[PDB]
Design an enzyme around this catalytic site. Structure first.
Site, mmCIF file in Angstrom:
data_model
loop_
_atom_site.group_PDB
_atom_site.id
_atom_site.type_symbol
_atom_site.label_atom_id
_atom_site.label_comp_id
_atom_site.label_asym_id
_atom_site.label_seq_id
_atom_site.Cartn_x
_atom_site.Cartn_y
_atom_site.Cartn_z
ATOM 1 N N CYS C 152 0.819 -1.210 0.000
ATOM 2 C CA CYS C 152 0.000 0.000 0.000
ATOM 3 C C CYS C 152 0.853 1.259 0.000
ATOM 4 C CB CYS C 152 -0.984 -0.004 1.170
ATOM 5 S SG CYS C 152 -0.349 -0.392 2.806
ATOM 6 N N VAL C 156 0.102 4.372 -2.480
ATOM 7 C CA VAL C 156 -0.217 5.711 -1.994
ATOM 8 C C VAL C 156 0.703 6.742 -2.636
ATOM 9 C CG1 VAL C 156 -0.238 7.181 0.058
ATOM 10 C CG2 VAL C 156 -1.263 4.903 0.130
#
Ligand code: ICS
Ligand code: ICS
Ligand code: FE
Ligand code: FE
Ligand code: MG
Lengths: 522, 477, 522, 477
Positions: C152, C156
C-alpha cells in the site's frame, strides 16, 4: 410433552422433569436397585489394579470380545467374486446377523443366502436343504457362482459339504458346470479371519486343483494379490492404483469394492464388479502371489505354495513407511517394473507430513486392538511416528504373531513400555486403560463404551477413542477410508495428529482458566 | 391396485421359482378381502423358510436373547456357545435403560463362553460353571444370570439346566437356563415362547406367597414393550398420568424384581401380543390376572387404548383418562396440522417382525397416509387375523417374504415410502424410494404415545419429502 | 517444578498450585483488574440482542475481520506459474506476513521477495528499488519469470510499475526478453481475492495482448481453466482429474499444486510444476475459458472476453451436486467429450451418501463464512442436504453477490430462516450465534474463539466449529482436502454428519444420566 | 570448520550477487575472532535490506504492535490502516495472558480501521474518532487504547496525535498514538524504539505525583519478556521464590496499571535488551531506577542471573537465592542426565530476531551442544558485541541473512539442528535437517527458567533424534 416447532427425540426428551420424576419412581418403587453409594464403590473397584488381576485370571468367561466367527469372513470373501452369491449351509439366523453386521458398517446392501436347516436335520442331515437351496438360489437370484460356507450347527452334525454339493449336481438340481466352491467354516475355530482364509482356499482349489497340468508359473506375466478380510474400500482401491501406476500386471483375488459401493441411481444392483472366475482359473500362471494380510492367510499360503508352486514373498502388510517401501520393492523385483517417479514423490510427501507433525505425535501413548495384520501394521507405523503403543490387544492373535510384534517393539526405543496381549478382550483392555492410562485408544466402535467408563471416573481419566478398524457403526462413511500404502499412512497420520489437537483444544477452551494455551496456530 | 392386478402380480412374481418353492410361496401371499376374516382361509404362516430364497428372518436365540431376556438390565445374560451370535447382536437393539453399565446394569455388554473346538469335543458344562464363578467375582452387583443357548449346546448334549440348578443352589443365585438354540423353531417366534416358559419356570413364581409388597387397585404391568428409543417410557408416563401404577415393564428397562412383582398386579397390558401372549395367558390361568391388548401408535390408537384401559377400573381413572386426553389434544393436533398436509395421500409398504406391520397402521392414517402392503417375518395366523381388520380391502399381505418378492412387489406398486429393516434399507434407497427403519426407528424415537407421535411424524416427513429423492437421475441421462 | 519423566508444557504446568498462587498475587497486587462479578455482567451483556443492535450499528470499527489484503492473493496467483518468483514492490514487512500466513496454512516453504522500499522512497519513489530488486532477484534465485504486485505504501505514493519495469530493462538491469508481468494491488481496495484477479489479468495481458493477430479461437482444441484464489490442494487435483477422466484437453492457468506440496527427500525445491509460459501464450487459441470462482474473476473475465473473444460460460463454482453436474455438462458441450461412466458412478455414489446420511443432517442449522464463491457453493450444498444455513457471512462480498445468494435461498424451503451478511466481521457473527443459536459453525480457525466464547455462556450454548476454509492453522494437513466436485461434496458431507455424531456422542456420554442414548449404531 | 574454510565459504556464496549487493552483503558476514571484541571492527548491522534478496525481516509495525503494545492485555490496540497487517499478525505471537477475552482482555483479537480508498483520499482521522467511540461502547472494560499506525497513515498526512489528545480528554481515557508505520526504519527494531517512546510520552508518567503505592525494598520489574508460551511466568516464579516482588511485566501478560506502577520499583530487570533498553535508560535518567541485563535460558545462565540480581539487594535475598538454587538443582540435573547424553556434540545454527540468537547459547551448551553459526534479523552493534563473547572462536556470524545465504551456509556446514522462524522451518526439514522454531517455540515452552529448561531439553531431543530423519531417501535410490 412436545413443542411442535422444536420436537425432542429421546435425548433430550427424557431429561424433562416429568420423565425424570417418573423414572425415579420406577426405580424406587419396583427395581430394588443397589444404593448409589454402593454402585459408586463397585465402579471405583473395577478401575483398580486389584480388580485387574482378578479380571486377567479369567479362564471361562469372555466379556466384550474383539472378534467375530468364521462364516462372516467367508461371506466377505465370497462377495469379492463376480456375480457370486455367498451361501451359508446351516441355520438362517446366522445369515441375518452376517448381513446386518456388514449392512451397518458399509451402509450398503449385503446379499447372502441360507439353506435354512432346522432341528430335524439333526436326525437326517442337511442334504435336501442343499439340493433345494442351490436350485432355488440359482433360479431366483441368478448368480453365476455360489460360494458355500457353514454355520456351527452344520459343523456339529457333520454334514459332508462336498458330497452334498456333488449329489445336488448328480440329481439335477443345478447343472454340473455351475461353480459351487465350498469351505467348512466352524465358528468354534479361530475367528472371522480364519473363515476368509478357508473360503478363499476353497475357491482357489475349486478352480485350479484338477487343472494344474497345463500351468506354467509366470506365463501370464502378472502378480496375484490376495487382500484377506478387508473392510476399507480405500484399501482395495489404493493397491490397484499403485500397481497400475507402476504398470504392473496384477490380479486382485477377492475384490468387493464395486459391490460394496454401488451408486444410488434408481436401480438396485445385487452384483457389481468382482474377481472373475477366469482370474482364479488362470492364477497359477502368475509370476507369484502376494498376501497382503499373511497372518490370516496361512491355509491359502500352503495351497498357493504347495499346488501353484509360487514362492510367496515374506512381506508384512503394506502399512506405514517401511512396509509400503518393502512391498513396492518386492513387486518391482518380481515384475521387473521400476518404481515410478509418481510413487517416489508420494512417499516423500508422506515423509514431509511426518516431519511437519512429529512434535505433536512424539511420545503419545496408545491402546489399540483389531485383527493381527492390521494391529501389527498400526504398531509399526506408530513407532515410525515416534508414538508409544503401550497396550496392544489382538483377541484373535496367536503366539507366533505375538513373538513377531514383540520383536518389532524391542527393536525401537518407542516400544519399551508396550505389551502385546492375545486371547484377551475389551473388558481386559478396559482395566489396562484405567491402571496404566494412555492418551488415546485406536479401535472400533465398541471402544466408545470404554471411553464412557473412563470419563465416569473423571474428565482427567477420560481416554478418547480414535475410530480405525471394524466395525465402525456410529460414524458415517469411514469405510471409504484407506489404511494401506502411503495414502493410508497419510490418512492415519492426519487422523492421529488432529485427534491430539482436537483434544488439546477441548482441554484449553476454558475462559480465563485454560485458554492461555488455546493457540490459533499449532 | 385392484384385487385383480395384485393377484396377477403375485402370479407373475412366482414364475421365477422352481416348482416346489413356487407352490409353497403362493400360500404365503394374499390379497385382503372383507368377506374373509379368518386368516386360515387365505394365508399360511409360521412355517419353515424355503432354502436359498433370502428370507429376512432370524432365529430363536434372537427372539429369546434379543427381546425377552437381553433387555432385563440388572441380570447378566450369557451368550453360550461360539463367539458369533453375541457379537452380531451386541447393542444392535435399542432397548433403552437407566443404569450404570458394567456395575449394576449390563444390557449393551456381550458376555459369552466363546466356545472353541475343545468345548465341542468335551462339552461346555464345566466351562459354564467356571464362567458363572467368574461372573460373580467380577460383577458382584448382578441380580441373576441367564444362559442363552446357541446352536451347539443342545447338539452336543450339554445339560445347562443341571449347571443352572447346581450353581444356583451353591451361590443362592437365580440362574435361568434358556434352550433357545437357533435350530429350534423356524424364526424368532419360538424363541419368544421358549423364553416366556423360562421366565415362568425359573423366575415368575419366586414371590408367589410373598405378601410384603403393598398393592393398590390401580396396579398394572406393561407386557411386551422393549423400550425402543424409550418407547415404553413414553407409554408409562401416560398410564401413570391416568392414575395407574406401572409395577413392571417387560422387558425394556426391566429388572428382575419387576418381573417377580408382576403376579401382584390387577391387569396386564399387552402391547406385543406375539412375544408375550404366552406368559399373559399363564398369569391369567395361575393368578387370575386379566390381560388386554392395546396400541400406543398414534393419537387415534393411543386415545382408544387409554379409554379401553380406564374402563377396566372405576370412574376416578376414567376421569383422569379424559384429563390426559385433554392435556395432549393440542399437542398432537399441532403435529397433525404441520405434517399431515405434507404426507396426505402417500402410500406405504411395511415389512417387519411380529407386531408393528399392523400396529403402526393407525399412526400412518393419522397423517393421511395409506398402508397398501404389509407383512411379517414370523407372525402366526392370529396376528394375520388382527391384520386383515386393520388393512384396507384389496391390499397386499406377505408372510416370510423373500428378498426377490419384496423387490418385485415394490417395483410394481411403487410406494412412496417403505418401512422395514436394516437388511432392506439400502436396497430401496438405491431405487429412489424413501425408507424408514421400523425396528430401530432409524436411531430416532420414541414412537409410542403422544410424545412419540410427534417424532414419528417429523421422521416420516423428513425422509419422504427429503431433497435427495429428486436427484437420483443424472441430468445427462 | 518439573518431574523429569513427565515434563509439563505450559498446559498443564501453569495449573500447578504454586503458579496459580503466583498468578493470583500478580492480579490482586498490580493489575487493578475489574471485579469478576463485573466481568461476568459485561460478558453476559455481550451475548444479548441489545448488544447485537449496537454491534451492527458500527460504521468505523472492524473487529476480527474475515478477509485479507490484495497482495496476498497476487502472491498465490504468481506461485502457480512455472519457475516464477512472486515479487511485491513496496515494503518488506508485508512480504514477511504473506509468507508466514501461507507457511502456517500449507506447512510448506513460500517463496516471495520484496524490493524493500523505505521512508526515503516517499520523497522520490521506488524506481531504484525496482531496478536493483529485479536484477538481484533474477541473479540470486534464478526464476524464469518475476510477477510484480504492490504494497500500500507504493500505491499511496503512486509508483508507475509499468514505467519502472520498462526503465529496468532499458538500463540493462534485466534482459529485455525476461518476462515481468505486473499488477497494481492496493490493499485498501477489495480484498485478497481482488489481488488474485488483478495479478492473473496482468499475467494474461503480458503474454497475449500484443500477439492476438495470429490467434484462432478453438484451434488448440483445449479448454482453459482459471481456478482463482484456492487454498485446498485437492481442488486443483480434482479438477484436473475429472477433466482427464473425460478425455478433455485443458490448460490450468495458475497451478500451484506442485510447489505447495514438494516431497521431503533431502532437497529443497524453490520451484516445482506450474503453468508454463507457452500455455499462457497459447491460451487465446482455446475453445473457451472456464472461471471456477467467477465472483472474484471479474477483471479476468473482461479481458478473456474482450481480447481473447471467448464466450465465458455462466457457471457457478463447481460445489455440491447441481453445480458439479452443470460444470461437467458445460465442459462436455464445449469439448464434445461425453461424461464417462466413471463420473456418472461417482455422482451416484455421492447421492448414495446423501440418502445414507440425510436423517442426521436434516434441519441442522449452520453459521458460515468465507470468500464469496466458496460461501455460495457451501450454501447451495447445505440446501441440497436439507440443512439450514441461517447466518451467512461474507466480509468481502458485494450487493450483487448477496442478491444472487438470496435468490438461491428463496428457491429452497431450507433457506427460509437464512440471512446473508456482507461487509460484516466475526465479531458481528459472534453476536448472531448467541442471539439466534445454530448447531454448528463452518469457517476458518478464527472461529475457535467464537466457540470458546459460546462455551463460557454454558455447555448448552456452545456452537462447535467445523473447519472448512482459509486459513486453517490449528489442525494439520487439512489443506490436502477437497471441496470441489463430487469428491469435495463427499468430504464435506462426511465431515458434517460426523461432526453431528461426535457432538451427540459427547452429549450422551454421561453415565446413568444421558448415556441411555449413547447408541453403538447411528 | 576452520576460519579459513568459513571465509572461503562466504566468498563462494557471494559470487552469485550483482556487484552492489555483493559489496553490501560482505559487510554483514563475519567469522568470530577472540582477538577482536569490538563488533564495529568486524560486522555491519542495522542497515537497509538489499532489494530482491528475500530478507527474513519484518517492519516497524511488527516491532511496535507485535511485542511492545499488543501483549498489554487490558488495552485495545487498533491496527490503523488497511486490513492486511492486523490480520496477518492476529494471534500469531504466543504472548500468553490471563483474562476474559473480548470482555476485559483483548490480545488475540484484531481491531482495525480497515482503510478503504475513501480513507486514503479524505484521511482517516474522522474514522479514527468514530472508531474510538465504538470501541468505548462495545468494550467498556478496556482500560486504554493504542493506535498502531500502518504504512498509509503518515503517507497521507493524518494527525493521529491530535485525535488521541482530543478523544482522550473527551473520554478521560489513555489513548496512545504510535507512529510505527512499516516504511519507518529498516526492520522491527525501530518499531521497538518508537513504541518505547510512546510508552514514555503517553503512559509511564501518569502516577508521577501519586504517593499511595506501598513499596518494598525488593520491588522489581521484568522488562522485555513477552511471555512466549509462559516464559515470563516461569521467570517470575523464581524471582519471587527468591524474596523479590515483581510489580510489573513488560509486556507479556502485562497490564496498563503495571506499566504505570513501574517507576515505583527499585530495579528494572531487562531480558530483551534490544526492545526495551530505551525505556530502561529513560527510567534511570528520570526516576533514578538502575537496570541490569539478565538471562534465564538454561541452568548455568539462570543461576548466574539469580545470583547477580540477588547481589543488588541484601543478605536475606542472597540467602533465599541459594535456597532457590538448591531446590531446583536436582530437577535440572535430572534433565541434564537424561538429555545431555542424547545431544552431546551436536552442532546448531541459529537465526532469530534481536536477542535469542545469543541468549539461548548457554542453554544449548548445558546440553553439550555447540552453536556453530548464529545471526539476527535486526540487531545493532551493541548486540553483536555481546554475541562475539558468547559464541565460540571461528564461528559464523550473519546479519540480515538472505534466504539464499542461509541455505548455502547450511549446505556446507551441515548442522545437526537449525533454530529459526516459520519462514525457514519447512525449507530445512525438506533437506533432512531437524528444525526447531525459536520464536514460537514450535507451540511448546516455556523455555525460560528451570521449568523451561526441562521443556527445552525435551524438545531439542524429540526433534533432533526423531525417527523421521532417517527416512528421507527412498531405499531404491
Ligand atoms: S418383540 Fe418382536 S422384529 Fe414384538 S422379535 Fe422383533 S422390539 Fe420387531 S415387529 Mo425387530 S414382534 Fe418387538 C419386534 Fe416386534 S426386534 Fe422388535 S422390531 S414388537
Ligand atoms: S522482543 Fe523481539 S523476533 Fe526481544 S521483535 Fe521478535 S518475543 Fe524474536 S529474538 Mo520473534 S528481540 Fe522478542 C523477539 Fe527477540 S517476536 Fe520475539 S522471537 S526477544
Ligand atoms: Fe450406502
Ligand atoms: Fe510440509
Ligand atoms: Mg443430533
Amino acid at each position: 410433552s412436545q413443542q411442535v416447532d422444536k420436537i425432542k427425540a429421546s435425548y433430550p426428551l427424557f431429561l424433562d422433569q416429568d420423565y425424570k420424576d417418573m423414572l425415579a419412581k420406577k426405580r424406587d418403587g419396583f427395581e430394588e436397585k443397589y444404593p448409589q453409594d454402593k454402585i459408586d464403590e463397585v465402579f471405583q473397584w473395577t478401575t483398580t489394579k486389584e480388580y485387574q488381576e482378578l479380571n486377567f485370571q479369567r479362564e471361562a468367561l469372555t466379556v466384550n470380545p474383539a472378534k467375530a466367527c468364521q462364516p462372516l469372513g467367508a461371506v466377505l470373501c465370497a462377495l469379492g467374486f463376480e456375480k457370486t452369491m455367498p451361501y451359508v449351509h446351516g441355520s438362517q439366523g446366522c445369515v441375518a446377523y452376517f448381513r446386518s453386521y456388514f449392512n451397518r458398517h458399509f451402509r450398503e446392501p449385503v446379499s447372502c443366502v441360507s439353506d435354512s436347516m432346522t432341528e430335524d436335520a439333526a436326525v437326517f442331515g442337511g442334504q435336501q436343504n442343499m439340493k433345494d437351496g442351490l436350485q432355488n438360489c440359482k433360479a431366483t437370484y441368478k448368480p453365476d457362482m455360489i460360494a458355500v460356507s457353514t454355520t456351527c450347527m452344520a459343523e456339529v452334525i457333520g454334514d459332508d459339504l462336498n458330497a452334498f454339493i456333488n449329489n445336488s449336481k448328480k440329481e439335477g438340481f443345478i447343472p454340473d458346470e455351475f461353480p459351487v466352491p465350498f469351505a467348512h467354516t466352524p465358528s468354534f475355530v479361530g475367528s472371522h479371519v480364519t473363515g476368509w482364509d478357508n473360503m478363499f482356499e476353497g475357491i482357489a482349489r475349486y478352480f485350479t486343483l484338477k487343472s494344474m497340468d497345463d500351468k506354467v508359473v509366470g506365463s501370464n506375466k502378472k502378480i496375484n494379490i490376495v487382500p484377506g478380510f478387508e473392510t476399507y474400500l480405500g484399501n482395495f482401491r489404493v493397491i490397484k492404483r499403485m500397481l497400475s501406476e507402476m504398470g504392473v500386471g496384477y490380479s486382485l483375488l477377492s475384490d468387493p469394492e464395486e459391490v460394496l459401493d454401488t451408486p444410488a441411481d434408481g436401480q438396485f444392483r445385487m452384483y457389481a464388479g468382482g474377481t472373475t472366475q477366469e482370474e482364479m482359473k488362470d492364477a497359477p500362471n502368475a509370476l507369484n502371489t502376494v498376501l497382503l494380510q499373511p497372518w490370516h492367510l496361512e491355509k491359502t499360503k500352503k495351497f498357493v505354495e504347495g499346488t501353484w508352486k509360487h514362492e510367496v514373498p515374506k512381506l508384512n502388510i503394506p502399512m506405514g513407511l517401511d512396509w509400503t517401501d518393502e512391498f513396492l520393492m518386492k513387486v518391482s523385483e518380481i515384475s521387473g517394473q521400476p518404481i515410478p517417479a509418481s510413487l517416489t514423490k508420494e512417499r516423500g510427501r508422506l515423509v514431509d507430513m511426518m516431519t511437519d507433525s512429529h512434535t505433536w505425535l512424539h511420545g503419545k501413548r496408545f491402546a489399540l486392538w483389531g485383527d493381527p495384520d492390521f494391529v501389527m501394521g498400526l504398531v509399526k507405523f506408530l513407532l515410525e511416528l515416534g508414538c508409544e503403543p503401550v497396550h496392544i490387544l489382538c483377541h484373535n492373535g496367536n503366539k507366533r504373531w505375538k513373538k513377531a510384534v514383540d520383536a518389532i517393539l524391542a527393536a525401537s526405543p518407542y516400544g519399551k513400555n508396550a505389551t502385546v496381549y492375545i486371547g484377551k478382550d475389551l473388558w481386559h483392555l478396559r482395566s489396562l486403560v484405567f491402571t496404566d492410562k494412555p492418551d488415546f485408544m485406536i479401535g472400533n466402535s465398541y471402544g466408545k463404551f470404554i471411553q464412557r467408563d473412563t470419563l465416569h471416573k473423571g474428565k482427567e481419566f477420560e481416554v478418547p477413542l480414535i475410530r480405525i478398524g471394524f466395525p465402525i457403526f456410529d460414524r458415517h462413511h469411514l469405510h471409504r477410508s484407506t489404511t494401506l500404502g502411503y495414502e493410508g499412512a497419510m490418512q492415519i497420520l492426519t487422523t492421529l495428529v488432529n485427534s491430539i489437537l482436537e483434544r488439546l483444544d477441548e482441554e484449553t477452551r476454558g475462559m480465563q482458566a485454560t485458554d492461555y494455551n488455546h493457540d490459533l496456530v499449532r | 391396485m385392484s384385487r385383480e392386478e395384485v393377484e396377477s402380480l403375485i402370479q407373475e412374481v412366482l414364475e421365477v421359482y422352481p416348482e416346489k418353492a413356487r407352490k409353497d410361496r403362493n400360500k404365503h401371499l394374499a390379497v385382503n378381502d372383507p368377506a374373509v376374516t379368518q386368516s386360515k382361509k387365505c394365508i399360511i404362516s409360521n412355517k419353515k423358510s424355503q432354502p436359498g430364497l433370502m428370507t429376512i428372518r432370524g432365529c430363536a436365540y434372537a427372539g429369546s436373547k434379543g427381546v425377552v431376556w437381553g433387555p432385563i438390565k440388572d441380570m447378566i445374560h450369557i451368550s453360550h456357545g461360539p463367539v458369533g451370535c453375541g457379537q452380531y447382536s451386541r447393542a444392535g437393539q435399542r432397548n433403552y435403560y437407566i443404569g450404570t453399565t458394567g456395575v449394576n446394569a449390563f444390557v449393551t455388554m456381550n458376555f459369552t463362553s466363546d466356545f472353541q473346538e475343545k468345548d465341542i469335543v468335551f462339552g461346555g458344562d464345566k466351562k459354564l460353571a467356571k464362567l458363572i464363578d467368574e461372573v460373580e467375582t467380577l460383577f458382584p452387583l448382578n441380580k441373576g444370570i441367564s444362559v442363552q443357548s446357541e446352536c451347539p449346546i443342545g447338539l452336543i448334549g450339554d445339560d445347562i439346566e443341571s449347571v443352572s440348578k447346581v450353581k444356583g443352589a451353591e451361590l443362592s443365585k437365580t440362574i435361568v437356563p434358556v434352550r433357545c438354540e437357533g435350530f429350534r423353531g423356524v424364526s424368532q417366534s419360538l424363541g419368544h415362547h421358549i423364553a416366556n416358559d423360562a421366565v415362568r419356570d425359573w423366575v415368575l413364581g419366586k414371590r408367589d406367597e410373598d405378601t410384603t409388597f403393598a398393592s393398590t387397585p390401580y396396579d398394572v404391568a406393561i407386557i411386551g414393550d422393549y423400550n425402543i428409543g424409550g418407547d415404553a417410557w413414553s407409554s408409562r408416563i401416560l398410564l401413570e398420568e391416568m392414575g395407574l401404577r406401572c409395577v413392571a415393564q417387560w422387558s425394556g428397562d426391566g429388572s428382575i424384581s419387576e418381573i417377580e412383582l408382576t403376579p401382584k398386579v390387577k391387569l396386564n397390558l399387552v402391547h406385543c401380543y406375539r412375544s408375550m401372549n404366552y406368559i399373559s395367558r399363564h398369569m391369567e390361568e395361575k393368578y387370575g390376572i386379566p390381560w388386554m391388548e392395546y396400541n400406543f401408535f398414534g393419537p387415534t390408537k393411543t386415545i382408544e387404548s387409554l379409554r379401553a384401559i380406564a374402563a377396566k377400573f372405576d370412574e376416578s381413572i376414567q376421569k383422569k383418562c379424559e384429563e390426559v386426553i385433554a392435556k395432549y389434544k393440542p399437542e398432537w393436533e399441532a403435529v397433525v396440522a404441520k405434517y399431515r398436509p405434507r404426507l396426505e395421500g402417500k402410500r406405504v409398504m411395511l415389512y417387519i417382525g411380529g407386531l408393528r406391520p399392523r400396529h403402526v397402521i393407525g399412526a400412518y392414517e393419522d397423517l393421511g397416509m395409506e398402508v397398501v402392503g404389509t407383512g411379517y417375518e414370523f407372525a402366526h395366523n392370529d396376528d394375520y387375523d388382527r391384520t386383515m381388520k386393520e388393512m384396507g380391502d384389496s391390499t397386499l399381505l406377505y408372510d416370510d417374504v423373500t428378498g426377490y418378492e419384496f423387490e418385485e412387489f415394490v417395483k410394481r406398486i411403487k410406494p412412496d415410502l417403505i418401512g422395514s429393516g436394516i437388511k432392506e434399507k439400502f436396497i430401496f434407497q438405491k431405487m429412489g424410494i424413501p425408507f424408514r427403519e421400523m425396528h430401530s426407528w432409524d436411531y430416532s424415537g420414541p414412537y409410542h404415545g403422544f410424545d412419540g407421535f410427534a417424532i414419528f411424524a417429523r421422521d416420516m416427513d423428513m425422509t419422504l419429502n427429503n431433497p435427495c429423492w429428486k436427484k437420483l437421475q443424472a441430468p445427462w441421462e
